[PDB]
């Protein structure tokens, strides 16, 4: 029988009015015997009519996949509106409903702290620039690095982790290899910046800088 | 029909011979109508007869949960042996098999670095003692904090994260509230320690100290 998966917008997309946040309802395991799929969409229980539904796509396992995309208004998402996708198909005993929304709770502002490498780390093949981001809610967030106005690509960021007070934290690590131009910038006292995007920040953005 | 899930031992359990590492086979969605479940266990395909089955727990959705627990030898697990669980039941077309073993590849030693709070963090409601653990493989690891040989429990540790070189890293964060005896110890210069257990460390253990 078919199955439905409902995906939220990307965190960057709801925070910048220039971007296009979307909720996406995906139906898989749609059969040949009953290939017709109907979508209904609701926002806080009220039906909306502006989703864009793609034609069905046959998969190599001889089932169909069908996708419907609803554009959301940035402030609706951030105001906690609920998005429901209802999927109808003759092979179902009844329609499948799925709902998604921003996690419930009072938003909380991230605190951002940059930490330089341990002195001991200079003996290894690289050093780590650390960005601690704590105290935030909900867990939807974006974290990036840059230096001299240009993005730094060699970084990895932990998932958010639930803290003992109900907020989240994470850490982001920018690697600076022993022999690299990035290492020479760090050595020269060049400034690196940890950038954070979150609904509870002013202008949804803050940067914290780090240098030797 | 029911479903089967198979779980590895806790990382700490395989690294100390005094502890009892276990592989656990969990059966979900077992009905009243066909309630009987059988287990067979195999190690590198060889039937072993020393597993023990727990009595079952009925779930709030009117299904049952059933489990079998097998004790393993620390060195069997660390040497990559394969553990197979076979589940039999009248409601299934054929028995279900699931297999598990330690991640494959050359173990790599964690490198451990303690980082003190950002000067900026002293303005907030707490400070964070940070432990960066990088360069380790496989991702199985345990991390704890202590001070004066006594455990410190107000900490959270991120999951392991895959780094760009195929090793893992994580961070562990020990919270030190603005007003607390633990803050008074940190202020006074007491040493706090990040303890790490991993198969590739000498004696499976290392500690790194941090003080003001
Ligand atoms: C027939 O084939 C298709 C595959 O299509 C293609 O063709 C075949 C022939 C092969 O070549 C395939 O390799 C090929 O892909 C099969 O369709 C698949 O069906 C499975 C289910 O059987 C679906 O699994 C779900 O996957 C989602 C994650 O999906 C995103 O990421 C995938 C990569 O990991 C990606 O492939 C998908 O397209 C997908 O969508 C995109 O994701 C990107 C990020 O990569 C995102 O940016 C995009 O926005 C998004 N796309 C769009 C258009 O927006 C996963 O989330 C699901 O897990 C949930 O459900 C599980 C139960 O099924 C559950 O165990 C999980 O824990 C999780 O559920 C959690 O708990 C509840 C819900 O239970 C919920 O509250 C929680 O929030 C939830 N999550 C957590 C964290 O707790 C699930 O694994 C595949 O997506 C789907 N593939 C495609 C392409 O649609 C089909 O199965 C085949 N049929 C047969 C019979 O063989
Ligand atoms: C009636 O209610 C029941 C309970 O609410 C339902 O049972 C649940 O059914 C779902 C889906 O059928 C199972 O989901 C799987 O969980 C696996 C992980 O389970 C571990 O972690 C969960 C989450 O915390 C925990 O509840 C489990 O008990 C289990 O770990 C135990 O606890 C700790 C935590 O890790 C662990 O250290 C212990 O070792 C272990 N306990 C013991 C005794 O050893 C996932 O790995 C599964 O992933 C599969 O499917 C994915 C599909 O996306 C895929 O990505 C994966 O590769 C993999 O194939 C899967 O998500 C729940 O485990 C199960 N709950 C319990 C308690 O068993 C029941 O379904 C419901 N009935 C109906 C009809 O709905």
UniProtKB/Swiss-Prot annotation, chains A, B:
Q: Does the keyword Glycoprotein apply?
A: yes
Q: Which Gene Ontology cellular component annotation is one that this UniProt entry carries?
A: immunoglobulin complex, circulating
State the Gene Ontology terms under molecular function: antigen binding; Fc-gamma receptor I complex binding; immunoglobulin receptor binding
Consequence recorded when altering residue 1 to A: Reduces the affinity for FCGR1A about 40-fold. Abolishes binding to FCGR2A and FCGR3A. Impairs ADCC of virus-infected cells by monocytes. Decreases binding to complement component C1q. Decreases complement-dependent cytotoxicity
Disulfide bond entries: 25-85, 131-194
Q: Which GO terms describe its biological process?
A: adaptive immune response; antibacterial humoral response; antibody-dependent cellular cytotoxicity; B cell receptor signaling pathway; complement activation, classical pathway; complement-dependent cytotoxicity
Task: Enumerate the residue ranges of region (CH2).
Answer: 1-104
Q: Work out whether the entry's keyword set contains Repressor.
A: no
Give coiled-coil spans as residue ranges.
none
Q: Where is this region: CH3?
A: 105-212
Q: Which domain of life is it from?
A: Eukaryota
Start and end residues of each Ig-like domain = 2-101, 110-211
Q: What is the effect of changing residue 86 to A?
A: Does not affect binding to FCGR1A. Only slightly affects binding to FCGR2A and FCGR3A. Impairs binding to complement component C1q. Impairs complement-dependent cytotoxicity
Q: How is it modified after translation?
A: Glycosylation on Asn-61 is required for interaction with Fc receptors and ability to activate the complement pathway. (Microbial infection) Deglycosylation on Asn-61 by S.pyogenes EndoS or Endos2 endoglucosidases prevents interaction between immunoglobulin-gamma (IgG) and Fc receptors, impairing ability to activate the complement pathway.
* The entry's keywords: Adaptive immunity, Cell membrane, Chromosomal rearrangement, Disulfide bond, Glycoprotein, Immunity, Immunoglobulin, Immunoglobulin domain, Membrane, Secreted, Transmembrane, Transmembrane helix
Q: Which residues are glycosylated?
A: 61
How does the annotation summarize its subunit structure?
Immunoglobulins are composed of two identical heavy chains and two identical light chains; disulfide-linked. Interacts with FCGR1A; this interaction mediates IgG effector functions on monocytes. Interacts with FCGR2A and FCGR3A.
Per the entry, what this protein does is:
Constant region of immunoglobulin heavy chains. Immunoglobulins, also known as antibodies, are membrane-bound or secreted glycoproteins produced by B lymphocytes. In the recognition phase of humoral immunity, the membrane-bound immunoglobulins serve as receptors which, upon binding of a specific antigen, trigger the clonal expansion and differentiation of B lymphocytes into immunoglobulins-secreting plasma cells. Secreted immunoglobulins mediate the effector phase of humoral immunity, which results in the elimination of bound antigens.
Q: Which disease is it linked to?
A: Multiple myeloma: A malignant tumor of plasma cells usually arising in the bone marrow and characterized by diffuse involvement of the skeletal system, hyperglobulinemia, Bence-Jones proteinuria and anemia. Complications of multiple myeloma are bone pain, hypercalcemia, renal failure and spinal cord compression. The aberrant antibodies that are produced lead to impaired humoral immunity and patients have a high prevalence of infection. Amyloidosis may develop in some patients.
State the name under which the record lists this protein.
Immunoglobulin heavy constant gamma 1
Q: Which gene encodes it?
A: IGHG1
| Segment of the intact protein contained | 120 to 326 of 399
């Amino acid at each position: 029988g078919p199955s439905v998966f409902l995906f939220p917008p990307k965190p960057k997309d709801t925070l910048m009015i220039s971007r296009t946040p979307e909720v996406t309802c995906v139906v898989v395991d749609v059969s040949h015997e009953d290939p017709e799929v109907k979508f209904n969409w609701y926002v806080d229980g009220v039906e909306v009519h502006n989703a864009k539904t793609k034609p069905r796509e046959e998969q190599y396992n001889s089932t169909y996949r069908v996708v419907s995309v609803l554009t959301v208004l940035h402030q609706d998402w951030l105001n906690g509106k609920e998005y429901k996708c209802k999927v109808s198909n003759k092979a179902l005993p009844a329609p499948i409903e799925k709902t998604i929304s921003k996690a419930k709770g009072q938003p909380r502002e991230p605190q951002v702290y940059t930490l330089p490498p341990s002195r001991d780390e200079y003996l290894s093949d690289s050093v780590s620039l650390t960005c601690l981001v704590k105290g935030f809610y909900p867990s939807d967030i974006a974290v990036e690095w840059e230096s001299n106005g240009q993005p730094e690509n060699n970084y990895k960021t932990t998932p958010p982790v639930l803290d003992s007070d109900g907020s989240f934290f994470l850490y982001s690590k920018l690697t600076v290899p022993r022999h690299s131009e990035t290492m020479r910038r760090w050595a020269h006292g060049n400034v690196f910046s940890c950038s954070v995007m979150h609904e509870a920040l002013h202008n949804h953005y803050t940067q914290k800088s780090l240098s030797l």
